Structure 1
Amino acid sequence: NYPLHQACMENEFFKVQELLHSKPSLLLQKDQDGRIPLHWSVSFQAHEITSFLLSKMENVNLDDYPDDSGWTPFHIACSVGNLEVVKSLYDRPLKPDLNKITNQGVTCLHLAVGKKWFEVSQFLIENGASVRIKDKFNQIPLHRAASVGSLKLIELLCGLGKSAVNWQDKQGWTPLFHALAEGHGDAAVLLVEKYGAEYDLVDNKGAKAEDVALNEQVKKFFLNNVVDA
C-alpha cells in the first residue's frame, strides 16, 4: 500500500533507495494520514534516511506539507526532541516558519516545552520563535512548562523569552494555577518570586490558585514561601 512510508518507519535505508529508484513519484506521496515519507523518517528518528530524503527535496518548503492534523515534519521533529534532526530541518535555504501552528493552534515551542525538551526549546527561542502565541485553549508555552513543573523551562521562557506571566487560559487559569494543581510547589514559588506572577487572581469558578493546589502540603509550602506584594 505505502511501501516508502513503511520503509521509513522500519528504518530500512537500502529499501528506501530501491523504491525511490523504481518509483520516484513516491517521494511526496501522502498517507491515509496525509503524511509524506519525511514525516515518518523524522518521527522514527531515521537520521540517515531523513538526510537522503532532504537531498531530493531541495526546493520543497516543509510548511507546505501539514498532516491531516496540521503537523509538518518540523512539528514532529520538535515533538520528538532530537536536536540534531531539528537543526537538520532548519539549516536549509528554505526555512520553516517557526510560528506556524497546527490545527489545534499549538506551535513547535508548545510541543517541545510540554515534552520538556530544553535544548530544542532554546534553539527555537534563539532563532525567533514567539513565546506568546496562544493555542485553542488560550494557553502559551509557559502554561505547559508550569504544568510539567520544569524550573529550567520556566526560567528559559520568562528570562530569555520575556514571556508574559499572568495570561489566563479559557478556564481562567494562569500558569501558576497549573503548577499548583499538578503539585509543583517550587515551580509555583519561582513564578511568583522571580517573575512577578500574581496569586490573587480568580478562576472562572472563583477559585484562587492556592485553592486548586494538589495537597495541603503543597499549599502550605507555597503560602510559606511567597511574599505579599
Structure 2
Amino acid sequence: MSNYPLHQACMENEFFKVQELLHSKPSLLLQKDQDGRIPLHWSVSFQAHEITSFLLSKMENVNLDDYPDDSGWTPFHIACSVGNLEVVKSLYDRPLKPDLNKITNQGVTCLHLAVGKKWFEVSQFLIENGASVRIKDKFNQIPLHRAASVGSLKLIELLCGLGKSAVNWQDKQGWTPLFHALAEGHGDAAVLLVEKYGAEYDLVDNKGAKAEDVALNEQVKKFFLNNVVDKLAAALEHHHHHH
C-alpha cells in the first residue's frame, strides 16, 4: 500500500519505522486506507504484538467498534479470526469494551470467526465474557453451524454445553448443524450432536433432503445411521426435544 506508509509499516512489522511515522505525522494513527482499515487492523492481522500494543497505548479513548473496515471488520474481528488469545485479551481488556456481538457486513460475529478457524481458547474467552452463541449471519447460521462444518467436537461441546446453544436451528438452506457435519464427512461430530445434544435428524432441507442424504459419502452416512437409533423401530418416542 503506497499512500499509506504507516499501514504498510505495520504489515512488515517495522516497529521502529511505525514509531518514526507517528512522530513525523501523528494524524496517521486513525487514518483509513483504501479498504477502510486503520493501522491497528494490519498489526493485529500480521500479529505484530509489539506494534499493536504501541498503537493501543495511543488509542486510550478509542472504541474499536467505531472502526469497522469497508468489509465490516473491526480490529477485534481480526484478532479473533487470527486466533492469538493474548492479542484478543489486550484488545478486550480496555476501558471501552467491544460489543462482543458486533457483526460484519455479512452478519458474522467474532465467535463465528474464532469457531470457524477452530480456535478453542479464543472461542471460550468470548463465550465466557458474554458473547452470544445464537446470532445468525446473513445465512441464518449461528457458530455451531460452523463448528459442525469444520467437524470440531471440542467446539460443539463448548457451544452446546457451556454455551447452551440451540441445536436444531435451520439456516437459509434449511440446514441444521447436523447437515453441515455430515456434508463435510465428520461422522463422529454428527453422532455427537444427535446422541449427546438432542439434534433431530428427521428434518428436511429446502430440497427435501434429510441430513443423512447430504452425507459426504456412503461410509460417513453408513456410520451415522448405525450410531443413531433406528426411529422406525423405536418403541417409544422422544419425551423431550431441545430448544
TM-score (norm 1): 0.99
Mapped to 1, the partners of 2:139 and 2:152 lie a distance apart of 20
CA distance in 2, matches of 1:37, 1:81: 19
User: CA separation in 2, counterparts of 1:105 and 1:215?
Assistant: 31
Q: Which residue of structure 2 lines up, in the alignment, with residue 43 of structure 1? A: 45
Aligned partner (choices 112, 116, 119) of residue 117 of structure 1? 119
SS across alignment from 2:30:
coil
How much does 1:227 deviate? 2.1
**Cα-to-partner distance string for 1:32-67 (whole Å, 9 max, x where unaligned):** 000000000000000000000100100000000000
What SS is found at the alignment partner of 2:43?
helix
Q: How many residues align?
A: 228
- 1:111-157 CA-to-partner distances (Å, cap 9, x unmatched) read 00000000000000000000000000000000000000000000000
For 1:108 and 1:96, the matched residues in 2 are separated by: 11
Measure, in 2, the Cα distance between the counterparts of 1:3 and 1:214. Answer: 47
Of 121, 128, 131, the residue aligned with 2:130 is 128
Of 219, 222, 225, the residue aligned with 2:221 is 219
1:59 aligns with 2:61: yes
- State how far apart, in whole Å, the 2-side matches of 1:205 and 1:4 are: 50
Distance 2:146 2:181 in 1: 9
Structure 2 unaligned blocks of 5 or more: 231-243
Percent identity, please. Answer: 100
Distance in 1 (alpha carbons) for counterparts of 2:65 and 2:204: 39
Q: Aligned partners of 1:65, 1:217: CA distance in 2, in Å? A: 47
C-alpha distance in 2 between matches for 1:44 and 1:26: 19
Q: CA deviation at 1:198?
A: 0.3
Within 5 A, what are the aligned runs for 1:67-106? Answer: 67-106=69-108
Secondary structure of the 1:178 match is helix
Answering whether residue 9 of structure 2 is matched by residue 14 of structure 1, we say no
Output one character per residue of 1:74-118: Cα deviation in whole Å (capped at 9) or x when no partner.
000000000010000000111100000000000000000000000
Q: Hey, what does 2:4 align to over in structure 1?
A: 2
CA deviations on 1:5-43 (whole Å, 9 max, x unpaired) are 000001001101100001000000000000000000000
Distance 2:220 2:31 in 1: 51
Per the alignment, in what secondary structure is the counterpart of residue 95 of structure 2?
coil
Post-superposition offset of 1:222: 0.5
| Cα separation, 2, equivalents of 1:174 and 1:54 | 40
SS of the counterpart of 1:163? coil
Q: Aligned equivalents of 2:228 and 2:198: distance in 1?
A: 11
Q: Distance in 1 between matches of 2:205 and 2:41?
A: 39
CA distances 1:193-223 after superposition (whole Å, capped 9, x unpaired): 0000000000111110111111111111101
Q: Which runs of 5+ in 1 are unaligned?
A: none
Say whether residues 1:144 and 2:146 are aligned partners.
Answer: yes
* Root mean square deviation of aligned Cα: 0.5
Number of the residue aligned with 1:31:
33
